[PDB]
Amino acid sequence: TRFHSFSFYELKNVTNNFDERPISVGGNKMGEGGFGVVYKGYVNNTTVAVKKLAAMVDITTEELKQQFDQEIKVMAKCQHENLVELLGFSSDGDDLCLVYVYMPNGSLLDRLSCLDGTPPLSWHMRCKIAQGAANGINFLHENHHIHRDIKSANILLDEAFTAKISDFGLARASEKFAQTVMTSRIVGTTAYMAPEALRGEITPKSDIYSFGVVLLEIITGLPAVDEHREPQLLLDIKEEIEDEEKTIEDYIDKKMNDADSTSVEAMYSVASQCLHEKKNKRPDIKKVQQLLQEMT
Template sequence: MNVGLSIAGAVLAGVGLGWLIFHYRQKKKQRLAAQHTETVSNDLPPPPSSKSISTPPSTTFTRSIPSYPSSKSDFGRASSYFGVQVFSYNELEEATNNFDPSRELGDGGFGAVYYGVLADGRVVAVKRLYENNFKRVEQFMNEVEILTRLRHQNLVTLYGCTSKRSRELLLVYEYIPNGTVADHLHGKRANSGLLSWTVRLNIAIETADALAYLHKSDIIHRDVKTNNILLDNDFHVKVADFGLSRLFPNDVTHVSTAPQGTPGYVDPEYYQCYQLTEKSDVYSFGVVLIELISSLQAVDTNRHRQNVNLAIMAVNKIQNHTLHELIDSSLGFETNSVVRRMATLVAELAFQCLQQQRDMRPSMEEVLEVLRGIQNGDLDAHKVKVVEMLINDEAGPLKGSVAPSSPDSVVTDK
């Protein structure tokens, strides 16, 4: 009997001791885990500030690249991302009156844009990415990341976006009320007569200013066109739509990527060699310059088959000394000698931008400098090798240069 009690007591004592050891080890593990969590949290960067949402675009060139969380998983949970607000789908649905079709401002290759008013009273433009765009998440993240690193008076401001895990992918921008350059040149606002030569030249300068800033910031826009150049009520420029834009490493000469963009604007060398460079934007800007002086669309199948592509048509007319057939007659090209000389110099600059070989094109910084010189009355434009077409018929412009070609088709998301 006594032996049995002794054995039972020993067993109970062993169990008790085992439980105490287990409990001690568990406490130690929890303590170590807590210390580790505290150490890791101290190593993380501070949470992104949302103060930059209300900061207006700077009037000087700045580049702000704060140390915000880069993990895409953080994007799904945070109240801000890269310093911009993360909106709920319901907020933006209410702001746009359930995406009322009457509030649609326009649509493009990646989504439709709607007029909206936020609960705090801000008037905004809400881009709603198309469901059938298989690259929409990539383009969504790309546009958010690029626009939150940059501040320039001629770049559209991003106020915020929805979570990547939202019911829909939505981007929220400042509202620019006066439509696009394309609207005023050959769209629904084309008959307003508000785009005088002075206004058009200023649009060219401000667009070149924005693109030169992007290139300084190692970014290629890759979809420069008049539909992506917005205008405020004073006809100042806001370049928009960075879904195709690419960060450009500063230690390489080009980025190899499948051509994307809008037919009529795509750099032919990029299309042929799959090599994207800053000069690809220069080519597209050359097309924009031709649109500004002609009021014609970059691609128009209603024109003669040889003139469907505006870039090719413009090069041919410049080389054949028939620039007067290209320039918009409402600009006073035939009657105003100052406009005639300025438009001629802009056409010559566009001709250089449209060269097929990228090494023959100027940089955006050089383009900007020449445009400012033309605006300031430096009509000799001595920094550019200009042969004055129509004014001097002794030789063709850039005699011996190669006329650019353009692809008939291009890989595009449209």
């Protein structure tokens, strides 16, 4: 309600009739994936990140409307240094759009991969980013919220490479741990998800796991999944290291000249604790926060 209500044809323009070409070459479309497509725009002189929702999977009306509702609803209460900022939205012209503040460095995912040829993130920059992400999450768990879709792709970077969590559409209003809560409709990103999450069980323990996957993604500079790589899953490296088959040293990203063993292995151990298969044998976000704060 405090968020500004745009009209659809107020922001179809700024997005350049939603120009499907990238910034690289003329057009607007910055990022795809999820349940829409994120374009750039220009309002109040400034740049912004617009997201036109669209039905790729889950082809049903109110579903995407409720995730839209959820996105907004969450963003109302939740505000933090390590969370994105919604400026407004657009429901009229029934194509659900969302206007945010522009993050000039986009996803952690992309900046690890160096998509469009960006410089490789130094160890030191990542350390901060890992701490930042963990902090933003802690706020959600404090404000009793589960994200249900934590991944590099949903962790974005401002003008100073500040980790800010994004996409609270699948986020769930939670309790302490009432008792074990469930869904029939299971949703999330497979390579990142916790086992119980993959069994439809909902819990703030499940977002800890997936952050483990990010902390690895960071250390290795390898995504959680790749259909042309053995092992296809990053996750599987844990057991490789856990069976002394290789060390973490072997997997440390080589696109860095500022990495050291102590910090790396500290960030490994933390990441492994998150990825402990017993949901309840894992540490809580705050314990993680601490561990990362201690690392430096």
